[PDB]
Structure 1
Amino acid sequence: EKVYQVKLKVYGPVHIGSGKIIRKQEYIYDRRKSLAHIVDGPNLVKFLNKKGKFTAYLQYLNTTKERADLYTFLRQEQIDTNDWKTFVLYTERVNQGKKGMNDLHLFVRDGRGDLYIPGSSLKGALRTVLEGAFHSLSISDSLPIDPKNLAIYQKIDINKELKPMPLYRECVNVGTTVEFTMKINSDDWTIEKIEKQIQQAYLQYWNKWFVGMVTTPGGKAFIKGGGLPSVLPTVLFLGGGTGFPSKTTHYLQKPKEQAQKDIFAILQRRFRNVYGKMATVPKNVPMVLKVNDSTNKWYQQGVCLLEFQP
């Protein structure tokens, strides 16, 4: 059995979810500083109990139920920044598409408390690309990710135009390198075979669907802002929110028109409130492209370039 070292080069922010979402009430958003202080609830509650501010917090939550940002409440009663750091877990960068944030999706962290990309998530992606029992393929969990490489991004849907939405997720910043250890057997899987299949899968993804978003005006703005990297090609959308083409082997295999019709049928079967109301197959299925930054560059969610080293 041969072994290799997988180098995941993050060209688009990657968010491996943890199953836990928080709201603007739970954490701190310094808009002027443009930083999101992720806090843990028990410490904040005990701090407010010690300071006697917990009743004020409950009243503030009651007053504006829909919008109850913690930062505005703490500014209301003038709580010191060090008092924040008492209960604040850690701060994160902010890249807001829209103002204040709405819903935050937390990254996956192990018991030791470090960020890491799980092996199973990489294995699933490589299985989606490689299918057509994967016991021979093995992916180790990633080496822990430095917290400096984590930042909050805002997801922008592009249905021929950019649209800010209440999507904010903790993602690995672009330019980050992630290390995995991969072991395969010579008989069943070949490293060259899987790399070639990754390349062909990305080529299909580009030809079948990506051009159908490039032609769009919002896609044109996405490209002009730098959303499409010059380099991107062993591309694999490892993260969550990459899109319907990603997470689905069938679109690449089916003829562009046949695949579009089948995807439209599936989406109408599942999501009747959006695609069910649509009478005909759109030019591109799915309709919207699946992220901006403080810099000039635009990004699409979850883009990665793999690099296997023996």
Structure 2
Amino acid sequence: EKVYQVKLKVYGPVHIGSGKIIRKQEYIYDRRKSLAHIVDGPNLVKFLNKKGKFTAYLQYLNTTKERADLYTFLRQEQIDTNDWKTFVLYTERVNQGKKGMNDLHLFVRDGRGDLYIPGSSLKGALRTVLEGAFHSLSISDSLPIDPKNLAIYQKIDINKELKPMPLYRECVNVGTTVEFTMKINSDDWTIEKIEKQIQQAYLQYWNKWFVGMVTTPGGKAFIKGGGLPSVLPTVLFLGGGTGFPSKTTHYLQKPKEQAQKDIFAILQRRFRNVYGKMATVPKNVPMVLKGVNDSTNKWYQQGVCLLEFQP
């Protein structure tokens, strides 16, 4: 069974969902800092009972149920940042697309707590492309990545406009390279075949859905800001929040009109409030593109990565 090193470069930030979403009240975000401090709840609680401010915390959250940010409260009580460090697990830069972060999706971490990409996630991303076996393909868990390459990126819905959604996802930063080891059986999989399939699937994704998405005014704004890099080859979307055109094989196997109609029927059946009320197939199915931006105001497509294979 041939073994190939698999290097993944993240063109656009990737969030693999640990399975945990944290409310703004749980974390500390300072807009001027542009830094969010992840706080282990039980320790913060214990700290606030020790200081006697726990009653004040409870009254604060009750007073403003819709907005319960910790930063505000901690500032209101004049608690020093040195005092904060005790109940702060770590700190990560924030790429806000709007103000105050509404909620945070935390990246997946092991029992040791090092950030890593599950070989299961990569395998599934490849499998979506390569369908058309799967015990012969082997994908390993990623080598743990340095936390310096993790930041929070705002979720922006791009459909005739760029609207920042109330979702924030810790994501592997752009430029970061993730290393995996792939083992394949010559009688089932050839690495040239895998790479060619991925390239063809990308091309199908680009010509059937991406171009129509660009034609919308929000897509034009996304492209003007640098949303589509020139290099974007072999492209795999491994991130959460990428969208319906990936993770499904409709655009990879069906004609553009046929694939659009089938996906539209699927969305009408599953989401009867957004697409069920609609009576006609729109220009793009699904309607909305997913995008992150940066402080340099450079836009990135969510979860877009380039895959390199070496013998």
Fold similarity call, TM over 0.5? yes
Contact conserved, 1:233 with 1:305, CA < 8 A, in 2? yes
Q: What 5-or-longer segments of structure 1 have no aligned partner?
A: none
Deviations 1:208-227 (A, max 9, x none): 00001111111000000000
Q: What residue ranges of structure 2 are gaps of 5+ in the alignment?
A: none
TM-score normalised to structure 1 length: 0.99
- The structural deviation recorded for 1:296 is 3.1
Q: Which whole-Å CA distance do the structure 2 matches of 1:30 and 1:157 have between them?
A: 24
Residue 31 of structure 1, CA deviation: 1.1
- Contact map agreement 2:10 2:306 (CA 8 A) in 1: yes
Distance 1:251 1:270 in 2: 18
Task: Output the CA distance in 2 between the equivalents of 1:250 and 1:63.
Answer: 49
User: What is the deviation of 1:289?
Assistant: 0.5
Mapped contact 1:97–1:292 kept (Cα < 8 A): yes
Output one character per residue of 1:243-277: Cα deviation in whole Å (capped at 9) or x when no partner.
Answer: 10110012221110000000000000000000111
- Kept in 1, the 8 Å contact 2:115–2:147? The answer is yes
Distance (whole Å) between structure 2 residues aligned to residue 300 and residue 54 of structure 1: 42
Distance in 1 (alpha carbons) for counterparts of 2:248 and 2:41: 37
Tell me if structure 1 keeps the 8 A contact 2:10–2:177.
yes
The Cα of 1:84 is off from its aligned counterpart by: 0.5
The answer as to whether partners of 1:157 and 1:165 remain within 8 angstroms in 2 is yes
Task: Work out whether residues 260 and 281 of structure 2, in 8 Å CA contact, stay in contact via their aligned partners in 1.
Answer: yes
Deviation for aligned residue 1:297: 1.3
Distance 1:296 1:64, change over 3 A: closer
2:31–2:100 Cα contact (<8 Å) kept: yes
Q: Give me the whole-angstrom Cα distance separating, in 2, the residues matched to 1:80 and 1:57.
A: 16
How much does 1:99 deviate? 1.0
| 1:151-178 deviations in Å (ceiling 9; x for gaps) | 0000100111111110100001000000
Contact 1:160 1:213 in 2 (8 A): no
For this pair of structures, how many residues does the alignment match? 310
1:155 and 2:187 correspond: no
1: CA distance between counterparts of 2:219 and 2:187?
43
Q: Aligned partners of 1:73, 1:133: CA distance in 2, in Å?
A: 55
C-alpha separation in 2, matches of 1:292 and 1:186: 41
CA contact (8 A) 1:158 1:218 kept: yes
SS of the residue corresponding to residue 129 of structure 1 reads helix
Counterpart Cα distance in 2 of 1:97 and 1:76:
26
Contact 1:28–1:70 under 8 Å retained in 2: yes
Per-residue displacement from partner, 1:35-82 (whole Å, max 9, x unpaired)?
A: 100111111011111111111111101100111100000000100001
1:239 & 1:158 partners in 2: Cα distance? 17
Q: What residue is the counterpart of 1:176 in the other structure?
A: 176
CA shift digits 1:15-37 (9 cap, x unpaired):
00011100100000011111100
- The structural deviation recorded for 1:133 is 4.0
Structure 1 consecutive aligned stretches of length 4 or more whose deviation exceeds 2 Å: none
CA contact (8 A) 2:133 2:188 kept: no
